[PDB]
Amino acid sequence: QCDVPPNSRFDCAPDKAITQEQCEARGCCYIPAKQMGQPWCFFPPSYPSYKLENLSSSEMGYTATLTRTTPTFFPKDILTLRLDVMMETENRLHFTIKDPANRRYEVPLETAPSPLYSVEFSEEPFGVIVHRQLDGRVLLNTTVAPLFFADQFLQLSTSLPSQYITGLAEHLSPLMLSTSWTRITLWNRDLAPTPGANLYGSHPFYLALEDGGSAHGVFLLNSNAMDVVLQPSPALSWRSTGGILDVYIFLGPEPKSVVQQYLDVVGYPFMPPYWGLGFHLCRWGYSSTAITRQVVENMTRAHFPLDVQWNDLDYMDSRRDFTFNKDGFRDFPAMVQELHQGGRRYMMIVDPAISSSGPAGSYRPYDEGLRRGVFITNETGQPLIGKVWPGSTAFPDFTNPTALAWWEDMVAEFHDQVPFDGMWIDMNEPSNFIRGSEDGCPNNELENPPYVPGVVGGTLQAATICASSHQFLSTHYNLHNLYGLTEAIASHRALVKARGTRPFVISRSTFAGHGRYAGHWTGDVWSSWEQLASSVPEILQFNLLGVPLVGADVCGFLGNTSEELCVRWTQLGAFYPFMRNHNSLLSLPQEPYSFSEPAQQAMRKALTLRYALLPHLYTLFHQAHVAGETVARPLFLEFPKDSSTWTVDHQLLWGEALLITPVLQAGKAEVTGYFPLGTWYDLQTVPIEALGSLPPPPAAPREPAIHSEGQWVTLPAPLDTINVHLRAGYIIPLQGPGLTTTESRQQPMALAVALTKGGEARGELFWDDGESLEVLERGAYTQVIFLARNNTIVNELVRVTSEGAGLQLQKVTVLGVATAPQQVLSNGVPVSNFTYSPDTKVLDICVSLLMGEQFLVSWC
Ligand SMILES: *[C@@H]1O[C@H](CO)[C@@H](O[C@@H]2O[C@H](CO)[C@@H](O[C@@H]3O[C@H](CO)[C@@H](O)[C@H](O)[C@@H]3O)[C@H](O)[C@H]2NC(C)=O)[C@H](O)[C@H]1NC(C)=O
Ligand SMILES: *[C@@H]1O[C@H](CO[C@@H]2O[C@@H](C)[C@@H](O)[C@@H](O)[C@@H]2O)[C@@H](O[C@@H]2O[C@H](CO)[C@@H](O)[C@H](O)[C@H]2NC(C)=O)[C@H](O)[C@H]1NC(C)=O
Ligand SMILES: *[C@@H]1O[C@H](CO[C@@H]2O[C@@H](C)[C@@H](O)[C@@H](O)[C@@H]2O)[C@@H](O[C@@H]2O[C@H](CO)[C@@H](O)[C@H](O)[C@H]2NC(C)=O)[C@H](O)[C@H]1NC(C)=O
Ligand SMILES: *[C@@H]1O[C@H](CO)[C@@H](O[C@@H]2O[C@H](CO)[C@@H](O)[C@H](O)[C@H]2NC(C)=O)[C@H](O)[C@H]1NC(C)=O
Ligand SMILES: *[C@@H]1O[C@H](CO)[C@@H](O[C@@H]2O[C@H](CO)[C@@H](O)[C@H](O)[C@H]2NC(C)=O)[C@H](O)[C@H]1NC(C)=O
Ligand SMILES: OCC[C@]1(CO)NC[C@H](O)[C@@H](O)[C@@H]1O
Ligand SMILES: [Cl-]
Ligand SMILES: [Cl-]
Ligand SMILES: [Cl-]
Ligand SMILES: [Cl-]
Ligand SMILES: [Cl-]
């Protein structure tokens, strides 16, 4: 009964240090491991679970009763449960386990012919078994361990199909999670990213790879503090401190299909405004309008693109929301109007917590919040008071419809004073400088629960508000992990109402489904080579979770950057879907114009290339928004049948076609990256115009094409270089240079056409006005497909409207042209001019065409 293979031992003492006698008293096996680790106290196969009874078939699927006869060692076991199994789509299986006698907290969320899955049940002990129909692989099997279902402790386990599992944000981790007895804690926490810690967000979703390259996904729709325990059998245990078991299985079979299927439940990513894809520049310490204006002037003088100027807390009156000081920021409204007049946008920090200490009637956000009962309340029904920047603060309850109306009003009123273009919502874990409240917290089972997950500080109260505090929908205990998400929803709505165009919200704290409303930055990362490297898996992870608008603070936030690190970080950071350089108060400056000439040239090239690629990056955001695609994606999402890609997370793709192989270490002049099977063209063979000086071309010419069998390749990568390769068979739209997207969007466009050996390629362009609401619903867009075939390039017009009708195509660069053409035609007429490079196999064609009018370019 205790002959259980070590890797297959499930912990019978997750709650406390236990003795052999206590362990055997629990009906468990005590066997010390021979050297988190393998549990010494573990469940025999006979450990009491639930029994399945009265399984019944409905049109949607199945229902049953689950009955526990022997209590567990947790208090308040729920001895009778109800199982509901819903066969919702061919790709999506959904089951819930609930208390049929009591409504329990549930997360608020908007809802051959055969399924890809089959489902069976173990009677005793109870388990759900989910097979992939096509190959019979066991994907879920909850029979592997007992079901625990107590008022403050839920535990459901499964086997995993492989050692390869990704998800369960937010943590500083490789993209593929360690199955070596790893405890992953979901409890939104203000902490500078560091290993083994619960960070700002919580996404209870994993994607598991299967031998051969198929995959499935599992979503536990549960917002309670939880541990997820991975063990090397391999197996996973969900351990939640409340709510219900609400489980979605997504059958793929392709990893990209698993992500789309998950986003069909939690929501497709929001479409950002085009300007949001430009460069953002921020620091803590731009302490006046004069200093802030000098930033834009200094960027412009040195020919650095900048779409969005930001401020941190500097702008506020005594660090209070919806104010600006009348010292350094007396002319704040004029500064923001000037930014707009120059074709730029403006962003500023907003905190959730509202100053509670000002004289009555002197501070409308607090006074009006009090009147309308918007704040989280304590035992006596008064506002819970904590401490953040302004001092004493109350915490808005963004589950209260009246708080949403109050937040809408405060945002609209402040926008009437200063016409900001979006919101940077920080400290929304929610972060508290003191423990719980100024008044501490009561002694109850929510503050002191029977199972405390592995949170930093060992309490749910650490760096946040009391767990037993009251919100409109439930206690903070149940809603904590949604705080940031609820603020992002409230802010998205506020900005729509205030501005009448697409909102731009960047949030610290997140939950599953955040991407439907907002983007994310990875928080208080150190200016270190280790954090540069760590940013790549974290940006990829957020893309798998449907938050494609993600990035890290370019050059890093905490401490002092070096010039070399800032060059490398700007190079990689130009491929973050959200690109902002942000910097801490006491740090040395790290704006692009603050470095040496050679470092400026490299940074200017990185920003020039990003601006040139914005039509393509915007098109990838359209695919995310309409089809649940990723924008930045790991190689294994694009080439899952190549197992060599599974552990790659220091390279990234943009969409299907652009492979970015950054240098992530000091003193390197080369980089080794994985190239999937195919031809990869060096993007340096595509001509790009810059407004300012770029690095001199390299001393030694580089290989124009990598012809890979699926292999590791060492690339030259001097300080002034980042490796970017374009996949053969793809066409990329580009647009001419500008210091803003207002300027760049007016420029003529270009195509980069990467031919297969067989002379084929395909690409697309999505174009709209860059900021209106309801574009897709109203049809206010242009959509064009580009096709290369048999020495011809054509466009196919999917939709052409006024937005996109004027788009000028002036250059076509064709890669992989084996022989000098004798003639190049545009619509049957010899072109004005073309160049062919025999060394690089590049055909560069000058044309005068319209994206929105059928053309035919040919060569022979
Ligand atoms: C629920 O939250 C309210 C705040 O909204 C808490 O009110 C606070 O109650 C404490 C006493 O328990 C007050 O401290 C007292 O301050 C006065 C003078 O300011 C001093 O003379 C007393 O010796 C004492 O320190 C505190 O002022 C008050 N805070 C505010 C903003 O009024 C209440 O305690 C909370 N209830 C629970 C059970 O946590
Ligand atoms: C499993 O179900 C049986 C039978 O339940 C009946 O049929 C169902 C479809 C539904 O219509 C129920 O309302 C019916 O009662 C349960 O056994 C019955 O228990 C009831 C009440 O305790 C008793 O009056 C009946 O005589 C029992 N019927 C039989 C045929 O034994 C049983 O309790 C269910 N098991 C669990 C664990 O809930
Ligand atoms: C980040 O750097 C600052 C500033 O460093 C100083 O100024 C630079 C131009 C450079 O020449 C450095 O070598 C200088 O030391 C550090 O703040 C300084 O810290 C020292 C020692 O604690 C203190 O005596 C100085 O007065 C500080 N100078 C200023 C202008 O604030 C800071 O410690 C560095 N941060 C980290 C994390 O190492
Ligand atoms: C699901 O997991 C359960 C438990 O690990 C598996 O059932 C065990 O299988 C072994 C080996 O065949 C038996 O000797 C044990 O008696 C089984 N235990 C129980 C509780 O039944 C089961 O095989 C797995 N299901 C699938 C399809 O893999
Ligand atoms: C913008 O650039 C100007 C000019 O380089 C900076 O002003 C100089 O700052 C140095 C300190 O490093 C002073 O000693 C000089 O007096 C300034 N020179 C001039 C010509 O004014 C300025 O600090 C930059 N501002 C920002 C916000 O980056
Ligand atoms: O806490 C000090 C830093 C700061 C101040 O607003 N808050 C936390 C954010 O993560 C930072 O980006 C931000 O600069
Ligand atoms: Cl002992
Ligand atoms: Cl007013
Ligand atoms: Cl509740
Ligand atoms: Cl390999
Ligand atoms: Cl032409």
mmCIF file of N, CA and C in Angstrom, residues 706-779:
data_model
loop_
_atom_site.group_PDB
_atom_site.id
_atom_site.type_symbol
_atom_site.label_atom_id
_atom_site.label_comp_id
_atom_site.label_asym_id
_atom_site.label_seq_id
_atom_site.Cartn_x
_atom_site.Cartn_y
_atom_site.Cartn_z
ATOM 1 N N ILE A 706 20.519 32.019 -44.325
ATOM 2 C CA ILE A 706 20.848 30.784 -43.555
ATOM 3 C C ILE A 706 19.967 29.659 -44.101
ATOM 4 N N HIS A 707 20.578 28.643 -44.716
ATOM 5 C CA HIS A 707 19.869 27.451 -45.246
ATOM 6 C C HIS A 707 19.946 26.370 -44.170
ATOM 7 N N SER A 708 18.931 26.287 -43.315
ATOM 8 C CA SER A 708 18.969 25.450 -42.094
ATOM 9 C C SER A 708 18.279 24.107 -42.351
ATOM 10 N N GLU A 709 18.835 23.053 -41.762
ATOM 11 C CA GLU A 709 18.206 21.707 -41.708
ATOM 12 C C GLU A 709 17.430 21.568 -40.393
ATOM 13 N N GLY A 710 17.371 22.633 -39.598
ATOM 14 C CA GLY A 710 16.915 22.555 -38.202
ATOM 15 C C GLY A 710 18.117 22.332 -37.325
ATOM 16 N N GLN A 711 18.780 23.413 -36.934
ATOM 17 C CA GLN A 711 20.136 23.326 -36.365
ATOM 18 C C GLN A 711 20.466 24.638 -35.675
ATOM 19 N N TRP A 712 21.471 24.580 -34.805
ATOM 20 C CA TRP A 712 22.094 25.719 -34.104
ATOM 21 C C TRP A 712 23.120 26.368 -35.023
ATOM 22 N N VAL A 713 23.098 27.692 -35.123
ATOM 23 C CA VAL A 713 23.990 28.496 -35.999
ATOM 24 C C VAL A 713 24.606 29.609 -35.154
ATOM 25 N N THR A 714 25.923 29.800 -35.259
ATOM 26 C CA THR A 714 26.658 30.920 -34.625
ATOM 27 C C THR A 714 26.695 32.092 -35.613
ATOM 28 N N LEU A 715 26.142 33.238 -35.212
ATOM 29 C CA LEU A 715 26.005 34.449 -36.062
ATOM 30 C C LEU A 715 26.963 35.509 -35.551
ATOM 31 N N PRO A 716 27.563 36.322 -36.446
ATOM 32 C CA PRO A 716 28.249 37.528 -36.016
ATOM 33 C C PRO A 716 27.200 38.443 -35.365
ATOM 34 N N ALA A 717 27.577 39.086 -34.271
ATOM 35 C CA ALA A 717 26.696 39.990 -33.502
ATOM 36 C C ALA A 717 27.553 40.995 -32.752
ATOM 37 N N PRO A 718 28.262 41.890 -33.474
ATOM 38 C CA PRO A 718 28.971 42.988 -32.830
ATOM 39 C C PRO A 718 27.985 43.868 -32.046
ATOM 40 N N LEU A 719 28.513 44.781 -31.239
ATOM 41 C CA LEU A 719 27.681 45.633 -30.355
ATOM 42 C C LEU A 719 26.591 46.345 -31.179
ATOM 43 N N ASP A 720 26.872 46.753 -32.419
ATOM 44 C CA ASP A 720 25.927 47.589 -33.208
ATOM 45 C C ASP A 720 24.893 46.735 -33.937
ATOM 46 N N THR A 721 24.840 45.430 -33.671
ATOM 47 C CA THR A 721 24.015 44.466 -34.432
ATOM 48 C C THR A 721 23.055 43.699 -33.512
ATOM 49 N N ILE A 722 21.808 43.540 -33.951
ATOM 50 C CA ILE A 722 20.943 42.407 -33.501
ATOM 51 C C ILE A 722 20.561 41.594 -34.728
ATOM 52 N N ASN A 723 20.630 40.273 -34.599
ATOM 53 C CA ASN A 723 20.263 39.326 -35.667
ATOM 54 C C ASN A 723 18.744 39.266 -35.804
ATOM 55 N N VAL A 724 18.265 39.596 -36.993
ATOM 56 C CA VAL A 724 16.837 39.435 -37.391
ATOM 57 C C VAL A 724 16.809 38.725 -38.741
ATOM 58 N N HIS A 725 16.081 37.610 -38.839
ATOM 59 C CA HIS A 725 15.986 36.818 -40.083
ATOM 60 C C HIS A 725 14.525 36.702 -40.486
ATOM 61 N N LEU A 726 14.278 36.755 -41.785
ATOM 62 C CA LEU A 726 12.933 36.637 -42.375
ATOM 63 C C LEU A 726 12.813 35.262 -43.012
ATOM 64 N N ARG A 727 11.784 34.543 -42.581
ATOM 65 C CA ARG A 727 11.433 33.181 -43.045
ATOM 66 C C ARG A 727 11.076 33.196 -44.531
ATOM 67 N N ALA A 728 11.713 32.330 -45.324
ATOM 68 C CA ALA A 728 11.330 32.160 -46.742
ATOM 69 C C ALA A 728 9.868 31.717 -46.818
ATOM 70 N N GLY A 729 9.119 32.351 -47.717
ATOM 71 C CA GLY A 729 7.691 32.101 -47.972
ATOM 72 C C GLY A 729 6.809 33.208 -47.401
ATOM 73 N N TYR A 730 7.401 34.314 -46.952
ATOM 74 C CA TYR A 730 6.670 35.409 -46.273
ATOM 75 C C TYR A 730 7.010 36.761 -46.893
ATOM 76 N N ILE A 731 5.994 37.614 -46.883
ATOM 77 C CA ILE A 731 6.015 39.018 -47.373
ATOM 78 C C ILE A 731 5.651 39.907 -46.188
ATOM 79 N N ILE A 732 6.487 40.897 -45.933
ATOM 80 C CA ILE A 732 6.340 41.859 -44.815
ATOM 81 C C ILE A 732 6.060 43.225 -45.422
ATOM 82 N N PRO A 733 5.004 43.930 -44.963
ATOM 83 C CA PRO A 733 4.826 45.337 -45.311
ATOM 84 C C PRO A 733 5.711 46.181 -44.405
ATOM 85 N N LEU A 734 6.289 47.244 -44.966
ATOM 86 C CA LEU A 734 7.091 48.244 -44.242
ATOM 87 C C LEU A 734 6.611 49.647 -44.604
ATOM 88 N N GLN A 735 6.935 50.615 -43.762
ATOM 89 C CA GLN A 735 6.601 52.025 -44.085
ATOM 90 C C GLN A 735 7.805 52.901 -43.749
ATOM 91 N N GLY A 736 7.919 54.022 -44.462
ATOM 92 C CA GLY A 736 9.055 54.945 -44.428
ATOM 93 C C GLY A 736 9.193 55.555 -43.054
ATOM 94 N N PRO A 737 10.258 56.362 -42.866
ATOM 95 C CA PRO A 737 10.678 56.766 -41.531
ATOM 96 C C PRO A 737 9.867 57.951 -41.011
ATOM 97 N N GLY A 738 9.950 58.138 -39.702
ATOM 98 C CA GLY A 738 9.329 59.256 -38.993
ATOM 99 C C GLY A 738 9.808 59.274 -37.567
ATOM 100 N N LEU A 739 9.720 60.411 -36.905
ATOM 101 C CA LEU A 739 10.048 60.479 -35.469
ATOM 102 C C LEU A 739 8.781 60.159 -34.665
ATOM 103 N N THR A 740 7.615 60.108 -35.314
ATOM 104 C CA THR A 740 6.317 59.696 -34.700
ATOM 105 C C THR A 740 5.554 58.852 -35.709
ATOM 106 N N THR A 741 4.570 58.083 -35.256
ATOM 107 C CA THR A 741 3.651 57.335 -36.132
ATOM 108 C C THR A 741 2.768 58.328 -36.898
ATOM 109 N N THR A 742 2.576 59.544 -36.375
ATOM 110 C CA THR A 742 1.799 60.582 -37.105
ATOM 111 C C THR A 742 2.519 60.895 -38.427
ATOM 112 N N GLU A 743 3.847 60.992 -38.377
ATOM 113 C CA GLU A 743 4.710 61.251 -39.557
ATOM 114 C C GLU A 743 4.867 59.948 -40.369
ATOM 115 N N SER A 744 5.184 58.819 -39.729
ATOM 116 C CA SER A 744 5.516 57.565 -40.460
ATOM 117 C C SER A 744 4.298 57.095 -41.278
ATOM 118 N N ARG A 745 3.071 57.215 -40.752
ATOM 119 C CA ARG A 745 1.858 56.670 -41.403
ATOM 120 C C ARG A 745 1.595 57.410 -42.730
ATOM 121 N N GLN A 746 2.190 58.582 -42.913
ATOM 122 C CA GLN A 746 2.008 59.394 -44.148
ATOM 123 C C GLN A 746 3.033 58.987 -45.213
ATOM 124 N N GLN A 747 4.006 58.144 -44.874
ATOM 125 C CA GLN A 747 5.129 57.808 -45.784
ATOM 126 C C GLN A 747 4.697 56.735 -46.768
ATOM 127 N N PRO A 748 5.375 56.628 -47.934
ATOM 128 C CA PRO A 748 5.155 55.495 -48.820
ATOM 129 C C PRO A 748 5.591 54.206 -48.113
ATOM 130 N N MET A 749 5.002 53.113 -48.563
ATOM 131 C CA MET A 749 5.237 51.767 -48.026
ATOM 132 C C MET A 749 6.181 50.986 -48.939
ATOM 133 N N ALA A 750 6.602 49.824 -48.460
ATOM 134 C CA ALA A 750 7.505 48.915 -49.178
ATOM 135 C C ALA A 750 7.075 47.496 -48.836
ATOM 136 N N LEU A 751 7.431 46.550 -49.686
ATOM 137 C CA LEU A 751 7.304 45.105 -49.389
ATOM 138 C C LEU A 751 8.698 44.495 -49.286
ATOM 139 N N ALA A 752 8.891 43.600 -48.310
ATOM 140 C CA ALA A 752 10.026 42.653 -48.282
ATOM 141 C C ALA A 752 9.465 41.275 -48.628
ATOM 142 N N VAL A 753 9.914 40.709 -49.740
ATOM 143 C CA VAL A 753 9.347 39.459 -50.328
ATOM 144 C C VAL A 753 10.402 38.348 -50.232
ATOM 145 N N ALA A 754 10.229 37.428 -49.280
ATOM 146 C CA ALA A 754 11.214 36.361 -48.989
ATOM 147 C C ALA A 754 10.794 35.107 -49.752
ATOM 148 N N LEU A 755 11.429 34.831 -50.894
ATOM 149 C CA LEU A 755 10.936 33.717 -51.743
ATOM 150 C C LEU A 755 11.401 32.380 -51.156
ATOM 151 N N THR A 756 10.567 31.370 -51.302
ATOM 152 C CA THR A 756 10.995 29.960 -51.128
ATOM 153 C C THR A 756 11.940 29.649 -52.294
ATOM 154 N N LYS A 757 12.654 28.533 -52.237
ATOM 155 C CA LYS A 757 13.405 28.005 -53.409
ATOM 156 C C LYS A 757 12.483 27.896 -54.630
ATOM 157 N N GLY A 758 11.223 27.494 -54.442
ATOM 158 C CA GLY A 758 10.212 27.355 -55.510
ATOM 159 C C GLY A 758 9.607 28.685 -55.952
ATOM 160 N N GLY A 759 10.047 29.810 -55.375
ATOM 161 C CA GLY A 759 9.638 31.154 -55.818
ATOM 162 C C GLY A 759 8.301 31.599 -55.242
ATOM 163 N N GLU A 760 7.881 31.069 -54.089
ATOM 164 C CA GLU A 760 6.560 31.414 -53.486
ATOM 165 C C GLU A 760 6.765 32.308 -52.258
ATOM 166 N N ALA A 761 5.766 33.130 -51.962
ATOM 167 C CA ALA A 761 5.690 33.883 -50.694
ATOM 168 C C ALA A 761 4.276 34.438 -50.546
ATOM 169 N N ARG A 762 3.877 34.654 -49.301
ATOM 170 C CA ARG A 762 2.548 35.226 -48.976
ATOM 171 C C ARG A 762 2.712 36.156 -47.777
ATOM 172 N N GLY A 763 1.947 37.243 -47.763
ATOM 173 C CA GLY A 763 1.924 38.196 -46.653
ATOM 174 C C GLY A 763 0.616 38.941 -46.617
ATOM 175 N N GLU A 764 0.455 39.816 -45.641
ATOM 176 C CA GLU A 764 -0.795 40.603 -45.584
ATOM 177 C C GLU A 764 -0.560 41.938 -44.907
ATOM 178 N N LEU A 765 -1.534 42.810 -45.086
ATOM 179 C CA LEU A 765 -1.564 44.145 -44.448
ATOM 180 C C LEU A 765 -2.992 44.401 -43.983
ATOM 181 N N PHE A 766 -3.123 44.787 -42.726
ATOM 182 C CA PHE A 766 -4.370 45.355 -42.170
ATOM 183 C C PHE A 766 -4.120 46.846 -41.942
ATOM 184 N N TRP A 767 -5.046 47.694 -42.383
ATOM 185 C CA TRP A 767 -4.892 49.153 -42.193
ATOM 186 C C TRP A 767 -6.236 49.771 -41.799
ATOM 187 N N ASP A 768 -6.237 50.624 -40.778
ATOM 188 C CA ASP A 768 -7.430 51.424 -40.402
ATOM 189 C C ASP A 768 -6.934 52.820 -39.995
ATOM 190 N N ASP A 769 -7.765 53.627 -39.339
ATOM 191 C CA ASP A 769 -7.370 55.021 -39.013
ATOM 192 C C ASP A 769 -6.464 55.023 -37.777
ATOM 193 N N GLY A 770 -6.215 53.856 -37.175
ATOM 194 C CA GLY A 770 -5.222 53.751 -36.100
ATOM 195 C C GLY A 770 -5.802 53.994 -34.720
ATOM 196 N N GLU A 771 -7.059 54.456 -34.577
ATOM 197 C CA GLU A 771 -7.548 54.769 -33.203
ATOM 198 C C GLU A 771 -9.053 54.673 -32.996
ATOM 199 N N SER A 772 -9.897 54.630 -34.033
ATOM 200 C CA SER A 772 -11.370 54.609 -33.821
ATOM 201 C C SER A 772 -11.826 53.312 -33.176
ATOM 202 N N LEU A 773 -12.944 53.409 -32.458
ATOM 203 C CA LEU A 773 -13.674 52.256 -31.887
ATOM 204 C C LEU A 773 -14.491 51.584 -32.998
ATOM 205 N N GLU A 774 -14.710 50.274 -32.879
ATOM 206 C CA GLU A 774 -15.737 49.498 -33.640
ATOM 207 C C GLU A 774 -15.350 49.440 -35.117
ATOM 208 N N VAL A 775 -14.057 49.482 -35.405
ATOM 209 C CA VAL A 775 -13.570 49.478 -36.811
ATOM 210 C C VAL A 775 -14.081 48.226 -37.539
ATOM 211 N N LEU A 776 -13.860 47.046 -36.973
ATOM 212 C CA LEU A 776 -14.172 45.753 -37.650
ATOM 213 C C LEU A 776 -15.691 45.652 -37.870
ATOM 214 N N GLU A 777 -16.474 45.948 -36.838
ATOM 215 C CA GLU A 777 -17.959 45.933 -36.883
ATOM 216 C C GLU A 777 -18.444 46.881 -37.993
ATOM 217 N N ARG A 778 -17.827 48.054 -38.146
ATOM 218 C CA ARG A 778 -18.269 49.086 -39.119
ATOM 219 C C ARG A 778 -17.632 48.886 -40.509
ATOM 220 N N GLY A 779 -16.612 48.038 -40.638
ATOM 221 C CA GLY A 779 -15.894 47.797 -41.913
ATOM 222 C C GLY A 779 -14.989 48.941 -42.342
#
